[PDB]
Design a protein around this ligand. Structure first.
Ligand SMILES: NC1=N[C@H]2[C@H](COC(=O)NS(=O)(=O)O)N=C(N)N3C[C@@H](OS(=O)(=O)O)C(O)(O)[C@]23N1
Length: 821
């Protein structure tokens, strides 16, 4: 196994070559491939000449476009503010679940708010070991008949870990970090031998401008600093006296044309302050307008002559996006100011001097100047993290992650070098961790910074707030949507994707505006930040909420999952279904499987619904399991048993009701199946005048109820299907869809020209054909999960937690960003 690292300079290739010698990662060999600039390396990676490089967030965006097709895979974790610990968050969630779902696991936290390494489930007496995230170490479960397991201690905090490491087995003459009672870093740190002191934030990163030799006054250190985003700054010497608003005509040093801190951040502010006569691409290129602003500059990678005049690279190296240009990058631009080739340098806080005292200070955009350690209040914006990138195909992602994880374990010299600063990686880097597997540049940079860097390259025509771009998941849907657009007078347009999750992505990225989602995609949509705009109202018995919008809705008409038993079976209650014989409509059904499997899992320590029951029928399971024993294949015997077809006599709503009456004690079905198959409503012989007053439903409190009281004695009601959009577009989509409904709904004034809720092109296109109308979602002041799902369903299926991961998109779309206001 090989990893080929692309380097951009002779200096960086030197450091990479040293790593090949010094860093011994078994199973994976590093090699180094030289190219002359950042862009030549991007192309080398695209072409397979190399596998990975580290990119500034501005280059991350550039590499993500079709020219190069690279994606970020590894970056340093950062933090925006202090958060609740995980254990305390989990406690709060589960205590907010549905109290009628009895016997749920409530985590046990310790005096620092972490998980006790032994976790227990009160109602079952089972204990197990957990990791720091509170996730069960599988195979450590012990039963109440046994003593609690012996679980290893939790991993130490960063500060306590690095303290114990530094001590080895007192470490004389070396820094030993000082930790607070919570095990985080004390704000002030001192070197126990040199006498120097400085400030750190809560995770131990140094605050620049605070390093203090002994005998001097130290700057005040802020406590509880969890904002570890990097900030773009403008740095100047204290011997000059201009302010930010007087930058016109000065000499400037920039980290580089493609860097977010050297280009995007300052240009963004130059434009917001109208220091720059530029606003759109009709006014020329931004680089040209900047060329008219400064007199001479060093901006590596530029083409305008004055914007390279101040660089000092020899011959073809001059003004190259490469360390062979001595003024390239953050520490290059600072050097350019130091040697007085510029009056101001544009870089980021992590490249500022460590020492408090000296000739440098910060130029604030509000036309004041402030000390180096005040960058959080004197900056040109937070900027995104930087990242290691590879091909979008990801053929080398695992080898790159393995190598860097193991090199970091062995403490290889990744993050400094005698040959120079910021070679291969930023010298300020401390750890590189893998990014979510579905991350791309949009989700890594965040919509705000992504749009901001797009905005400097093209005129981004924002689509109209009076048009809803509907996202379709198959060709018949697209055709029905084009017919809607033709009568809509421009209010409706169409986009095409392959599945609902890709529609969610398009809505997030501003390529579409709305889509109808089945219940099973809503957790993912709500977790990514979309909101229900309107919902499908399916109650055929009441059209009043559809006639007069805004009206009160007595019953929304959604199905309610119930547990169905015969009145003859007086001994069975909810609390004793273990080992009984159960009938499921099929594996994957929500009212007959997901809702029951969720409740069994929450009350029995995730013990399989397979093992929970005795002999059952659940079409879709493997034919050899105890979930197919009750399954009667086909009356016309063929290889049709436990099958996902009407071949299986026990498949579906009515089929599970068969399995109950024939050979079973309980069936999980919607509340409608019994009424559709009793009172002689089904002609078949087995339901021969079978009486609705011959069955009951099981309540979760151990009681029972006649099947007519499904409203207050159900496993869980389902939520309606929902039309979701971005938070800011809810009001638009509601207004447009309600107007369309008055024209083309079931009582539409123009229903002869188009019908929203049916079609000849197929079934349930865009909306479900049984929809009565779309009802605006009345947002309540509670968690959106509880608001949309209802507490019962949220608890039953997701444990009332925001931490389930039904889709691998969720970790990408919830990734946190470094954006401004
Ligand atoms: N904000 C809000 N509006 C409701 C409508 C449906 O309204 C009924 O279901 N009507 S009703 O007559 O049957 O109550 N949409 C939802 N997805 N919800 C979930 C339900 O959760 S519930 O609280 O478990 O019903 C709800 O809260 O109603 C509701 N939450």
């Amino acid at each position: 196994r090989h990893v080929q690292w692309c380097t951009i300079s002779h200096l960086e290739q030197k450091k990479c070559n040293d790593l090949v010698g010094s860093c011994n990662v078994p199973d994976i060999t590093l090699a180094c491939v030289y190219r002359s600039s950042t862009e030549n390396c991007m192309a080398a990676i695209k072409d397979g000449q190399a596998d990975a490089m580290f990119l500034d967030s501005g280059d991350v965006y550039k590499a993500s476009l079709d020219h190069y097709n690279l994606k970020p895979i590894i970056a340093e974790p950062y933090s925006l503010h202090r958060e609740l610990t995980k254990c305390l968050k989990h406690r709060q969630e589960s205590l907010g679940g549905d109290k009628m779902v009895k016997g749920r696991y409530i985590p046990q936290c310790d005096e620092k708010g972490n998980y006790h390494p032994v976790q227990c489930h009160a109602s079952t007496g089972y204990c197990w070991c957990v990791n720091a995230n509170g996730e069960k170490i599988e195979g450590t479960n012990t039963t109440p008949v046994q003593t609690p397991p012996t679980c290893p201690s939790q991993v130490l905090t960063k500060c306590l870990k690095e303290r114990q490491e530094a001590l080895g087995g007192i470490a004389i003459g070396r820094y030993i970090p000082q930790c607070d009672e919570q095990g985080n870093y004390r704000p002030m740190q001192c070197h126990g031998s040199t006498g120097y002191c400085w400030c750190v934030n809560a995770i131990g990163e140094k605050i620049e401008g605070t390093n203090t030799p002994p005998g001097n006054t130290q700057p005040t250190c802020q406590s509880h600093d969890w904002d570890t985003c990097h900030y773009a700054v403008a740095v100047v010497k204290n011997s000059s006296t201009f302010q930010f608003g007087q930058l016109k005509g000065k000499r400037s040093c920039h980290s580089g044309l493609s860097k977010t801190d050297g280009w995007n951040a300052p240009v963004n502010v130059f434009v917001e302050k109208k220091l720059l006569p530029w606003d759109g691409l009709a006014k020329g290129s931004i680089e040209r307008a900047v060329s008219k602003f400064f007199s001479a500059s060093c901006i590596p990678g530029a083409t305008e002559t004055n914007l390279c005049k101040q660089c000092i690279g020899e011959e073809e190296k001059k003004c190259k996006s490469s360390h062979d240009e001595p003024y390239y990058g953050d520490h290059g631009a600072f050097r350019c100011l130091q040697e007085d080739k510029g009056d101001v340098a544009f870089l980021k806080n992590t490249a500022l001097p460590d020492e408090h005292s000296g000739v440098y200070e910060l130029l604030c955009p509000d036309n004041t100047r402030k000390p180096l350690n005040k960058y959080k209040e004197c900056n040109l914006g937070k900027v995104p993290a930087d990242a290691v990138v590879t091909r979008k195909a990801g053929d080398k992602t695992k080898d790159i992650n393995d190598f860097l994880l193991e090199a970091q374990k062995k403490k290889c010299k990744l993050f400094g070098s005698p040959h120079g600063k910021d070679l291969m990686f930023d010298d300020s880097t401390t750890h590189l961790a893998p990014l979510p597997s579905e991350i791309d540049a949009f989700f890594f940079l965040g919509v705000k910074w992504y749009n901001a860097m797009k905005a400097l390259t093209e005129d981004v025509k924002l689509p109209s707030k009076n048009k809803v771009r509907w996202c379709t998941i198959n060709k018949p849907e697209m055709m029905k949507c084009k017919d809607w657009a033709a009568v809509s007078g421009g209010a409706i347009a169409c986009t095409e994707a392959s599945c609902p999750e890709h529609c969610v992505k398009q809505i997030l990225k501003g390529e579409a505006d709305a889509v109808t989602l089945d219940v099973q995609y809503m957790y993912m949509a709500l977790m990514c930040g979309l909101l229900p705009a309107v919902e499908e109202y399916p109650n055929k018995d009441d059209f009043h909420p559809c006639q007069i919008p805004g009206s009160t809705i007595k019953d929304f008409g959604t199905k309610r999952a119930v547990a169905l038993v015969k009145k003859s079976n007086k001994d069975i209650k909810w609390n004793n279904l273990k080992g009984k014989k159960s009938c499921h409509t099929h594996v994957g059904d929500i009212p007959g499987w997901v809702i029951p499997a969720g409740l069994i899992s929450n009350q029995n320590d995730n013990i399989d619904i397979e093992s929970f029951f005795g002999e059952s029928c659940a079409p879709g399971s493997d034919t050899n399991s105890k979930l197919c024993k009750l399954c009667i294949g086909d009356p016309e015997n063929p290889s049709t048993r436990c099958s996902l077809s009407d071949k299986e006599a026990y498949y579906g709503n009515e089929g599970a009701f068969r399995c109950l009456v024939e050979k079973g004690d309980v069936a999980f079905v919607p509340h409608t199946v019994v009424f559709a198959n009793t009172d002689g409503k089904n002609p078949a012989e087995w339901a021969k005048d079978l009486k609705s007053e011959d069955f009951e439903i099981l309540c979760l409190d151990g009681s029972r109820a006649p099947v007519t009281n499904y409203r207050g004695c159900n496993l869980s009601g389902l939520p309606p299907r929902a039309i979701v959009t971005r938070e800011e577009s809810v009001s638009d989509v509601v207004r447009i869809l309600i107007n369309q409904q008055s024209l083309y709904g079931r009582n539409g004034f123009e229903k002869d020209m188009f019908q929203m809720f049916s079609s000849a092109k197929g079934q349930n296109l865009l909306f479900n054909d049984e929809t009565q109308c779309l009802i605006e979602f009345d947002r309540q002041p509670k968690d959106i999960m509880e608001d949309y799902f209802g507490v019962r369903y949220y608890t039953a299926v997701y444990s009332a937690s925001r931490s389930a991961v039904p889709s691998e998109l969720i970790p990408a779309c919830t990734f946190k960003h470094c954006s401004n206001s």
